[PDB]
Every structure is written in C-alpha cells, then in structure tokens.
Ligand binder design. Sequence first.
Ligand SMILES: O=CCCCC[C@@H]1SC[C@@H]2NC(=O)N[C@@H]21
Ligand SMILES: O=CCCCC[C@@H]1SC[C@@H]2NC(=O)N[C@@H]21
Ligand SMILES: O=CCCCC[C@@H]1SC[C@@H]2NC(=O)N[C@@H]21
Lengths: 173, 529, 541, 541
Amino acid sequence: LNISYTRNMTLKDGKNNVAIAVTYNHDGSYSMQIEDKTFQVLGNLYSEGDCTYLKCSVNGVASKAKLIILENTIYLFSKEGSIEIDIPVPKYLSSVSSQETQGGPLAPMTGTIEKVFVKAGDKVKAGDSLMVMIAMKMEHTIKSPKDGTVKKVFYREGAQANRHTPLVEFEEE
Amino acid sequence: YHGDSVASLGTQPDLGSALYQENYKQMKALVNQLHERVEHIKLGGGEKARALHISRGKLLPRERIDNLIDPGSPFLELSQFAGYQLYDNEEVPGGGIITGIGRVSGVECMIIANDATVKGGAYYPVTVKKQLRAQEIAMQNRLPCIYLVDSGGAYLPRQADVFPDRDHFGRTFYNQAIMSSKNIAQIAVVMGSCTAGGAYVPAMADENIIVRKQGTIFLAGSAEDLGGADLHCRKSGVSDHWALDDHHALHLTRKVVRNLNYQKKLDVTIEPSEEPLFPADELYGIVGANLKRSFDVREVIARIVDGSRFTEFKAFYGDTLVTGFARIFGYPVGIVGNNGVLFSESAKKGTHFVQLCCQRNIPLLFLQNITGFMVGREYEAEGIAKDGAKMVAAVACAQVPKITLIIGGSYGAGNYGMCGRAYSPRFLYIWPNARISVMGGEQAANVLATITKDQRAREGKQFSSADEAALKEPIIKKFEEEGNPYYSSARVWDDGIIDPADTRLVLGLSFSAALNAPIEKTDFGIFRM
Amino acid sequence: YHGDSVASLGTQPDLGSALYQENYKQMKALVNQLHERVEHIKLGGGEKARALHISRGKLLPRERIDNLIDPGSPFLELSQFAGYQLYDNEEVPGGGIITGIGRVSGVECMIIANDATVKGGAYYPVTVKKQLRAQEIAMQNRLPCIYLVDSGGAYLPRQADVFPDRDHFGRTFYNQAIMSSKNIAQIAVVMGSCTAGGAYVPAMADENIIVRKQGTIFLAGPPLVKAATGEEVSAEDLGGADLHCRKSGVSDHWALDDHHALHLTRKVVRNLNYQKKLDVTIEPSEEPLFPADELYGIVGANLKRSFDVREVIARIVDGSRFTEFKAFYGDTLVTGFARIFGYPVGIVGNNGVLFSESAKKGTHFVQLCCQRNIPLLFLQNITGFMVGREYEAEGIAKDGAKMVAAVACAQVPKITLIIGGSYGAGNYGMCGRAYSPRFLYIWPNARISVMGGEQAANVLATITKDQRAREGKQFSSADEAALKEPIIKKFEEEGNPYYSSARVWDDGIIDPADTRLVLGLSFSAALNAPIEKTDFGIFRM
Amino acid sequence: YHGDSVASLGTQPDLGSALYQENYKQMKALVNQLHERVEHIKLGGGEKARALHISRGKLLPRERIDNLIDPGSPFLELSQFAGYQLYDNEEVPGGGIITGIGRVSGVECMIIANDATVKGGAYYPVTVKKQLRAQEIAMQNRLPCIYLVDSGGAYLPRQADVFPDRDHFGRTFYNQAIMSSKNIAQIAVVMGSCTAGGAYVPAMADENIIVRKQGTIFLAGPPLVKAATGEEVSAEDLGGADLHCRKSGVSDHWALDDHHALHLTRKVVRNLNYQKKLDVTIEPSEEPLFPADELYGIVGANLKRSFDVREVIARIVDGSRFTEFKAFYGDTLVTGFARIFGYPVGIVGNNGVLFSESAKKGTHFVQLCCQRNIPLLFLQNITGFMVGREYEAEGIAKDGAKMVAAVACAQVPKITLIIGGSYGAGNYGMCGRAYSPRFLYIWPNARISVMGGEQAANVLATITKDQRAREGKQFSSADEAALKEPIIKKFEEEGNPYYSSARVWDDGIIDPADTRLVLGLSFSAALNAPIEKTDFGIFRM
Ligand SMILES: O=CCCCC[C@@H]1SC[C@@H]2NC(=O)N[C@@H]21
Ligand SMILES: O=CCCCC[C@@H]1SC[C@@H]2NC(=O)N[C@@H]21
Ligand SMILES: O=CCCCC[C@@H]1SC[C@@H]2NC(=O)N[C@@H]21
C-alpha cells in the first residue's frame, strides 16, 4: 500500500556473490539493480514437451532458454550457451557441526588393491601415498589427507575395495 | 445455470470536460502527497538509528516482515499514519509499531512488529492503541497473531496514558489470553530486548522463539546473563525454540505456523472473479476533492465490483441511498452507499436491505459520503428520528462481516447509521479527500452565528458583520484541521488512508481475511415500527 | 449438618498503642475529607442553577432517583468523583451525570440520569465515559437500564473527544441496541429537553416515557431547522410535542409531571416478567466479630508500613470465619474461602512482595473457584521500593504470567478493592481495571501508577548518574534532587485516588467502614446474571 | 506454500562396528523366533482337526477372512499370541479366535472369527478377553463388527472365569447392544454350530446371515431338550434350521455355503450408507530416508545399553522430517511433530530417566496436541537399575503426576509402542494399557513389570541383609543369591513379551521392520471416529 516492494536476493556465480535488488512493479514487470546498473525484466514460463522454458526480455532484449532448478543450482540452457547459478544455502539448513577430521580417502572406484605403503601404526604427511588401486585398467594412487599417524588399515594387497569405502583409519587428535 | 446476460453499471466519463480535468488534477495531488509521506514514514527512526540497528546484526523491522511472509504475497499494512504529528515535538513514524495482515505458510496471519529504530521501541500511547486495534482485528477474524518483539518498555513521561486503564497496556496480555483460549494461535518471536511488561509477551504466547544473543527477557531489568536465549531456552524454559539469527528465527516461525493444523473453510458461495469494466484511475476525475460538488455513487461501484455487475434493490424508493448485490473477487457483497441527504424513505430502505443480507449471510460494504439528515418540521412530525434509529439499530446487530469506506463527508448521526467506527466494522478505510466531525465546519459556524447574533440582538448591544467572522473564522479552521484525514488517521480512528485506485484490491484482501471466521446468526432487537 | 464449631480470624488491636492512635487519626482525616467533598458534589451546578431548575417545575436529579427507587432501599452510586478537577477552569460535579444501582419494584436496575444543573446537561468527554461504564456494568450483570434523560447535547469545544471514536458518544446507542437484543430492558424517561442526537435515546428504548410540557425530542433543534429551511418553530412544537406522543408515536407513555413519570416507570419495571434466580448456595448472614472502624487504626495512611491483610478480612466476612488455602506456602499471598451476606466468596489478598510460590498458589486457587463457580474478591496492596522490590525477577516473570492468564480467563464474577499500592505488573495479576472485574473500588489511602514514585526517582538517579559518570562531566548530589523532586511530585499527584477516580479508572472511593456494605451490594447485583463455565488457555508449566 | 526446505533426522550407522554387528545378530534371532512361532499358530488345532473341518464342507477360519476382505488388501491381525502357554497342558493357538481389522467393500471393519479347529471352538477365559478387546477397539474407532460364528460354547472346567463377572462372556452381548445403539453396524454370519448362549450373537446382530446345512442356532441344545423334556431332536431341526431362516425368522439372509455367505456379507457392508471423513489435514506420503531393517543393529536386544530414540523416529516418519519441541529442556524426553503416511502425529519417546523437567515438558506438549487435535504416539523405553534410578524422587513424584493426568484426559487418538523396558510409574506416564491407548504394540525385545528384575533383587538384598544384621544372626553372601536368583528368574519370565502377549496386555508383538506399516494401518483405522474436544482436570501447579 502506497509503496513498492523491493526484494534483496543473493546469487552465487562461481565464487562471487551477486546482490540483486528486485522491485515488483504494478504492471507485473521487475526492475533489477545489480551494482550500478538497472535492468527492466519481464517474462513467463511455458512448457514444450517435458521441458520448462523461460521466455524473458531484459532491457527490451528478448530471448528463450530452458530452465532447470535442481538442488541449489539454476541451469539456463540457451543456444548462446549454458550458465549455472548457485542459490546460497542458509547456514541453519546446512548440517550444524559439519563432518570434521575426515580420514579415509575413498576408492575412486571398485578395483583391486595393488600396493599398500602403510603399516598398522605409521606416521604420514599430507601427500604420502597410502595405497595403489587398479580399476578397469586405470591406476589410482591414494594419498594421505592429513599429517596424523595411521590408526588402522581396512584392506590388504589383492583385496577388491568397493567405491567410497574407507581405506585407512587415522588416530583422533 | 449461470449463462444469463445481464446489464452492467457505469458510464464513460467526459475526459475532455473541464470538471473532469480539474477533479483529476486535485485528486492526483492528494494521492502524490499521500505517497511521499508514506515514503518518509517507511524510513522509521532515521539513518543513524537504522545504521545502529544493522550494526548489531539485526534485520530492519520491515525486512523482517518481507522474509516472514510467503514469497511475493501482498501485505496489507494497517494504520500507517498512527502518530503522525500527534505529539508536539516528537516524531513517531507509524507509532513505533508495524501491523498488517500477510500470508505465512499459506495462512493469513496478523503480524505485530515493534520498530526498534523509533525511540528505541518505546511504547507511546498511540503505540498501545495501534497494537490493541490489531489484536481486535485478529480476534474478530480468527487470525493467528505473530509478535516480532523488539521493545524498550513504556514511555515514562506519558505513563498515565499507557498503564492504568482498561484499554491501556494491560489489555494487551488480556487479549493474548483470550485468543489462546479460543484456539487462535499466539506466536512470539523475541528478536530483541523485552523488559517489564514486555517479558510477559513471550511468556503468554502458545509457542515462543528467541534469537541467540539479541533477545533478552526479564521481569526486572549483564542483560544476556539476566535474560538471553540460553538462560530461557535451557534453564528457565521460557523459550520453546532457539534461533541463531533473525533469518533463522523467521524460518522457524514459518515452520511453527505450518504445524497449526488449520485449513480455511468458506461459508459463502463463490463465483469466478472478473475485473471491473472501467479503469479505476477514472475515480480521480469523477470524485475530485471538492465535497460540495456531488457525484453518482454508482460510478464508484461500477469501478470496483466484478464485471461492473450490480443488482439494485428498491432503486426508485429513497433514491438518496443506493443498495444492491454485487461480487468482489468472487465474494458476494451487499453495498450501501450515500447518494444525497438521508430521508425517512432512505432509512427504511436501508433497514430492509440489512435484514436481507443478514438472513442470507452476505457481507456488507458501506460507502459513506454523507451531508446530514433531512431537516424540516414535517419530517420530524413523521418520525425521521424514529426512522433513522431503525437503521442504527439494524446495523449494530448485524453479525455479517462489515467493511466501511469513507469516500466523502462523515458528519453527525449519519456516521452512526452508515456503520461508523463505533459500530465495530471489521475494517474502516478513508479516501484522502474525506472529512469527519460531529458536524460540517460551516454548520457549526452558521449555528454559532445564530447564537451570538441572537446573544447581542436580544441583549441589545448591536453585533456587526465584522464581529461575525471574528466568530466564524476560528471555528471553520478548527473543524477543517480536526476533520482532515491525517488528523483522523494519526489517531487510530480508521485502519488507513488508501489511494482510490487501490480500493478494489484493499477490499478484496480485507473481505478475504474476514472470511476466516464462520458467520454467525444475527439476533435483532425490537424494531420500533 | 452445619453445627460444627470452627475457628475465627481477627485479633483485638492495641487501642492504646501510639501506632494505632496515629493511624486512626490520619485515616479519619482522609475519610472526613472524602465526605465533605462529596457534599459539595451533591449540590451539582449550584444554587442559581438549582433555583432555575426548580422554577420550571422539574425535580432535582437526585430527588428523581429518590422517588424512583423503592422506599428506604439503599442506592449504590458509582463514580461520584468523575470530572473532579479534570478540566482546567470548568467545574463539572460528578461529570454531569448520576449513575448507580437501586431497586425498582423489587428489581435491581441501573439508573442513568443527566444532571441538567451542570452545564445545562451537556456531554463532556468524561460524561460519555461514565455513561459507557454504567452500560458495561448493566450488560455484564443483566441489569435493566433506566435513562432519566435531561441533556443539552455534546460539548462542542471538545467534540473530537466525544463524537468520533469507538468508545465515544456513538457507542451509547450501540450498547442500547445490544442489550435490547439480549432481553435486558431499556427504559427511557424524557424529563427535559432531548437535544440533537439525544432524540435517539428515547427512540432506541424498548419502552419510553415523556413528560407533557417539559419533554422535547427532536433530531434537529429549532435553530438547525431555522438555519437549514429558514423556519421558526417552538421547541414543544418541533419535538417532545403531543406530536411526539401521538402524531409521531415516538412516546409510549404520556406523563403530566416528574412525579407522574416516575410512578409510570415503576409500573413499567413491574411488567418485565423477571424473577431473580441464584446459581450459588446460600447460608444465613452474620455480622463480623470485630468493629469495622478499627480498620482506621490498623491500616492508617502510610503505605511504607505493613499490616496483616487477615485483619481486614476478619472485619468484613460473615462471622469472621475464613478457611485459608495453602497458608504456609507463598505466605506473601493470602487465599481462602469465606461468605459475605451469605454469598460464597474466594478472597485473594496481598501480604507482601509477590514471589514464584505466591503466583503458583494464586493460580491454583483461581482454578478451584472457577471449577465450583465461586465469586472472587481481590484485595490489592502491592509493595514498592523495598529491598524485596530490588530482587531478581526472572523467576517472577516466568511464574507471574500464569496468574495473569488464569485471572483473565476466569468467568466467575470478580470484584477488586485497592486497599494500598497498585504498581506495575502486580496490578494485572490482581485483576486490575484492564481485566474486567465487575466492580473496582479504592480506599482513600490508595496509590496507583506504573511504578512507585520512589522507584522511578531512583531509577532515573541511576541513568543520569551514569549519564555524567560515563560521559565524564561530574553530576553532583544537588543535581540529583533537581532530577528526583519533579518525578516524585508527578507520581504522587497522578497516583492520588482522586486523580484516578476523577477519570473513570475505578467505580468510586469508599470509606473503609463501608467496605462490607459496598461488597454486599455489589455481589448481590453481580448475581443477577448466570455464571458461565470457564475456559482456560494453555498453562505454561 | 509448502516449498520450504527443512532438515531431516537420522544418521548412517556404522555397519562395520562390532556393536552394530552384535545387535543386528541378536535382534534378527528374536525376529526369526517370532516368525516361526506364528507359523505354528497359523495351523490352529492341527492336521487332524483341519482335515475334519474341511471334510464337512466348511472353509478354514483364515481362508474365510481372506475371502471376506477386499482382494489384496492388508489385514491387521491382533493378539496372535493370546493363550500362548497360558494353560498348563492345553494348547490354544491364538486363543481359539482370530481378530483383526480389514477392508470389506472399501470400509474398515473389525472381523471376529471363531477357530473351530481349536478345541471345537470352545470359549476359554482368554478367548473372552480377546473378543472383548476387539469389541473395545471397534467401538472406540466406530468400526463395523463382523462375527464369523462357529463356536462350541463355554469351557465348563473353567466356567468361573468365563460366565459371572462384568468382563466375562456376558459383556459380549452388552457391547453388541451398545454399538448397535450408536449406529456401529453389527453383522453376524453363522457358519457353523451356535451353541447354548451363542444363539444370542446372531439374534443381537443388526443383520444376520446363516449357512443352509452347517449353521445351527439354538438356546438349548438337543441334549438339554432331551434332558429337560425327554425329547430327541437333530441339531438342524432344533436350530439353524430352515425353521430359523423362515419359520423362526431369526435369519435375515440364507446362504448355500461358506463362499456364498462371505459374498452376502460383502453386499451387506456395501449397503451401510457410510463414507469415511477425515478431521485432520493431509499431506502427500513419503518414505523414510533410512532403511527400517537398520533398527536391528541400532536397538539390539540388550536393554542395559542405550540408544538415541531419534534414530528410531528417523526410520518411521515421512521423509525422516521431525520438528523437535523443547529440544534442550528435559533432554531425557523427546517430543516433536511429524507425519506418518500423511497423517499428523505428535511423538513422545523416552531417551533416559524421567526428570521433573521431562515431565513438565511432556505435559506442555500433550496440551498442544490436544488443542490442535493431533494424534499422539508414545515410544516407551523406561530405564531401570541405574545410579540415576537410585535418585531422590520427591520432585519426580510431584511433577510426574502432571503427565499421568494430562495423558489420561487427552481425547486425541493415542497409540503406544514399547520398544524397551516398561517399569513402575513410568509406564503410566507413557500411556500404558491402563490409560486406554487405541492400540498398544511391543517389540520382541521389550520387558514390562512393576520394577526391573534387578531392582527387586537388590531391594530384597537390603531388606533381609537388614533382617539378619539388625536381628543379629549373620546373613552371608551365598545366602544373598539364595534370595536374588529366584527373584530375577521370576521377573525375567513374567516380563517376557510372550508372557505379556499371551495374556491380552498388548495387541501384538511386531517386527521392528514392520513398525511403520503397523502404525500407518492403526492410525488410519483410528481416524474413522471424529476427534472430540479434550477436557482436563486441575493441573496441580
Ligand atoms: O588384458 C586386456 C587387454 C589390454 C591389456 C593386455 C596386455 S597389452 C600388453 C600385453 N600384450 C598383449 O597382447 N596383451 C597384454
Ligand atoms: O450548512 C449550514 C446550515 C444550513 C444547511 C445545512 C443542511 S440542512 C440539511 C442538512 N441537515 C443538516 O443537519 N445539515 C444540512
Ligand atoms: O435339571 C436337570 C436337567 C433337566 C431339567 C432342567 C430344566 S429344563 C427347564 C429349565 N431350563 C433349563 O435349561 N434347565 C431347566
């Protein structure tokens, strides 16, 4: 009533946070200000087959693109190109007490263990090779994530290790 | 079968006519004046206060509401002009409190947020009245109440007008207790300091949320140790939910409302909505700002009802009053509007119409543009007072939702018959050109010009024409100043001053909110035949 | 079987003690001051106005009430001090209106009579508030309303405080319409001129009586007809005419004079087909075992000294019999069951600073009374500026609300009597004006405000001592009383009983010796309405 | 708007951990033991009895239910273990009666079928209790009752425990009459002999179906007629005759065989003119985010070890979404809102020893659910013999009662699931059998008794150590286990889930992997009745 609603939105392009001030106009259009530049934006959503399409006009320039919003990423597909924009995730929703002191680099894939370079108790530094695994004839060398001493080893040479299974246990510090 | 073709109201105004050009220009200036004043009120305490508020990590009060309500949903703010020039040297934008109706998790709720940037959130006498009005609206319509609490306590220099009386600060907790007993959810969000009576608000709420460090609760006033989220959340137990920051608390509030297990049910029949057949901005030219000129109220109706369709009741009887059935955004409505001086026939026609709407449970809308009652020896002999009372008595007892819109003058007993503030309409709005007082400014001047002309003619000292305006000019100035819409709205006599182009939208939002409560059966008193 | 012997409250005070002598002397002076001020208010406008009123053949407003009520019946007048020094240079004795409860034809009714000798019966802002309070009392207790209408219209210089708002003059007609719809009889007697906008009062009434020559009812006065249509009409011809009685039909009964109209009113009430029914058990009445005037010595006028509220109870309840509930728990609050004039009552009275235990004890007691449909009486004496007032209140806030919430939802009749201080949130917990007690009375020694005068002074003496200690310019002790003395004066003036009663915050200032009688009359009137079931909100455990 | 993203409960357990491996192995063995025992109960009387039953052209009792309910619909059987080892030398699989809830013609109904292969369908004391429990469930949820009657009368050797008392066989007809008066349809199908006193069941029903050759209904059997009047009559001639169908009129429908009778029953239910209406809000269903079988490893069979009840919740609620209420206050109790198959539910589960804060937190939560008409689910895991169990309980007693009193008065549907121990007053506060939960289920690892076995042993080890220390004859450590070992054995035997379920204390022992399905079916059935307003007693603050 008697004023215009302006919404402060934040979007992440790569590592850069972009602040967008969106004003809801009476006619149904939107006035967006990014930094010192203002844009007049109007558009709508229409469906072709199973794909949702965004028809928009920015400062009088009209374009069409395929819109997909999965998880926190906005995918825009246009014949000019494809752009991904990340929606910031509120801290509260992000698991508080996020996982910490992760020890085991996980097998890149299901493959035979060809070499083990670490004993049950061994002091290792970041970048110290722990194990070598061959998967579909492709050699991967597992490397030490931390400088912590090794608490235990979950696999021995010749064992087949499934994808994303812990390979080494590191002593709690 | 709803395929019948029907007639529609409204006519195309003469845009070239000088009267239309003048009326549009005058009304436009009033609307522009209204808009820019709200812009200033939007800023609250000011840049220094706002900068200090943000420096503490807290959101601005209006940003809190924006994040609380559903994305893109309209927000119906109430009494934006409370406290406007009310106090001699103190500026209190919006009364220090922001109240309105918005949608949270798909549910219409009443939101009451203290503006900490205005006098540190202290409660002025108008602040209490504005909050009490909001609570009254929530109870009458069964709207859940959300309190964004950030307050500094009562304003001691004016304590006598805040603490003691029935409609003083104490009534706020009484309303919370009553609504809770009726299953009208009371949710409090402590986003700041609350002291003395303020601490009772979170305690009296059904569910309560407090921010980690900003929020503080204590009967007697470090603040964090005495109060604080941790103490109440973990030790005192006063806190039901613990929030990291303002954004987290608002997210929690939306979750709380979603668990109310409430679903809206409509008692009225619904039909598809249709836009009016005429532009709303034409109301500027049609109405203007000169109350002495008269316009056809049907023109106003034609530009707010669905499809400009209107079924007039008793069109040729008591023509100074217009009554009929229409629909706004699909809801059925019975409209009563003034089209001249009230007569005995007009009052009888209104009384008959109000009974019809109450019988069918149809909401009522009143359009007040009054100029008084018919004055004459014959009319009194025929019981005009008896007829006028018939309408005051029917309007009072009606239990259907009632909304009043003052589009012109509102004087004397005509105000009561047209559902004034004293008759508990669910909402009351006024246009920027309205005037309200016990009587018109001129009538009070002329009446006094009879009493003292008599005073000196009968006494015998002559009283000249120049002595007349030393009598009349101060009276006219007083009534003009006290009848101004801003004077009426600064105090909470109405729920806001609205742009005429926004009339249809405001009515649609208001009626939608009023339908959250079931419509009760109407019991009338004795009709003095 | 009711033959059991029981213990009784009260002890004999030491009449020889200096404290008792001083307390009696101070309280007596206050009562004498109260009496003589009422005597002046009794005279209304004055000798010249009264002589003019009688010269027109009309009865004086208080003589009308005397003739209306049953012979010898007591009359409970309300808000005698409304408008006392309220307006700077205008004296408005009693607000220009007399309201009270009396018995007409054996039925308790609310009587609202305009005092035509005061400003010609014009409606001042306080006049509207006093009338609205009377209507609220009548509706809550289902008391028929009798309007002795003799008014001169609204006071134009203060129109903004009379006309527009919800609790302004318009609400008067709204209340009449609502009560009529509930079968609460509305009777109007036009015993004098009814001005513009007052003509509605006769019309909105269920039954109406108008005096032959004196009464005039017109929506537009002869002057407005003269201004609007250029027509000159006598007041009798325009309204209150034989035209109103016969041609217009607004009048239901026609009366020769004031005496005849009052006789007709008594007949109208007798035809209401109403009979009072009691929802509560009744026991024979008994006088208290101690004289009431001893309350002067016991209580005194010094709020800093403390007294045992049980002494006050012992001198107002039947036989001084009292069953205390949770006597040893939360001892700062006293709760128990008693009887006044045979009616059962649950009494809640302050005996010190409120604690968490006291609030819990009160909340438990209020639930008991609501369950059994027992009327509640509150005796407010809140304590201020004590070392106890200077205490951690975090627990007090958590537990007090429970009492504010129980008291608000209680549906049993509630009567509040302020026998001492009434400060802060303690007022709310003890059923303040905001919590709709059926009646609220105050003793002449009471004080009410947001906080005690001293606390406001001391609090400010911390804020500005800090202001200049933290800022660095020193702020001396003499600078302290240039801060404290104006504050203490303001709170003393605005907390005075007359200040509170001049505005309608209470229903009257009563002599302590009259406490038992006033309570008996009030509870008797409140029992005219059936007691409803109480629905509570969520108790925050 | 329901598009908000929210947090979800649950964590991935360490499958490699030794504790998880051991817990899974132990719980799996219990589930396998439960499954194979039910398989044996499934066979009823045995091969010889089953062969004889089929030789008469009658369907087996469980085949009758399969044909009665809608094709492919789930069937919720109740009290499968009633009578398990209850009687010393007599095996009574399932108590001789099969009861459960299934869908007939799209309507949820309670089905009560006698198992004629078990002791010829005679009524043992447990048989009466099982039937009475089924009728209680049907009445509380307004479920139509279908009686597949094939019975041999009361078991005379135990008549004193069947006939006389209020909860004895007579109550069965009382329940039928009461449900009929409430418009809860009572349908009886006589598919076999109806003995003396069972002839009432067809008669007391609203609509009745009898099989042509097999069915016989007679108040007095051919032997009693022969003894009383010296008359010899065939069973078909005396009752269940074409005489009963036509001449006597006791039969409303005539059926050729068992298949025909079941077809007729479905038609009868379709004509009830009933449509289910929901009082609660509904949201789309979602599966939990974690596998249910992980509950084996998480919970195990060792009651001394403790687990986080939130893990159990995360694996049964829609989407593993849970809004916790008062998370950090009284942390030994977990309360919050969730949804199961779209229905809203308030969950109360134990997470340790009950404290004063926990009881207060529970009491507050129960009021919230009752106000909003939200069904309540209780997860009982009470803790016993801990240093915490050895604590001052004076506060616990004062505050616990508040929860016992709120839980009792709650009128929302209540379902209780015992996932661990259930001892002492903790059982009452968590909606035990005595507090009329709509359903009560137990996991195969549960234990229930007045107190934990160890506590009773230790308590006695204090009383007699005292007995001989105070008396003066020494009482040695070996004398201690001649005291403790018999007590521990008794409590272990009587607290076993099968002991509790053999008698009807619960409605069945359920596999943890089936917890979500059983709760979904139970809550769906409980919603057939409208939710009433809750009236509370006095909350002792
Ligand atoms: O074994 C799978 C195919 C690719 C690896 C085979 C190696 S390539 C070197 C050597 N020479 C052969 O012909 N085979 C093995
Ligand atoms: O405005 C000045 C006094 C004469 C005109 C006022 C008119 S008369 C008809 C109508 N009714 C009133 O009470 N006032 C206006
Ligand atoms: O008492 C011994 C058996 C035969 C006599 C019993 C009589 S027959 C009439 C009455 N009805 C019964 O069921 N028993 C008795």
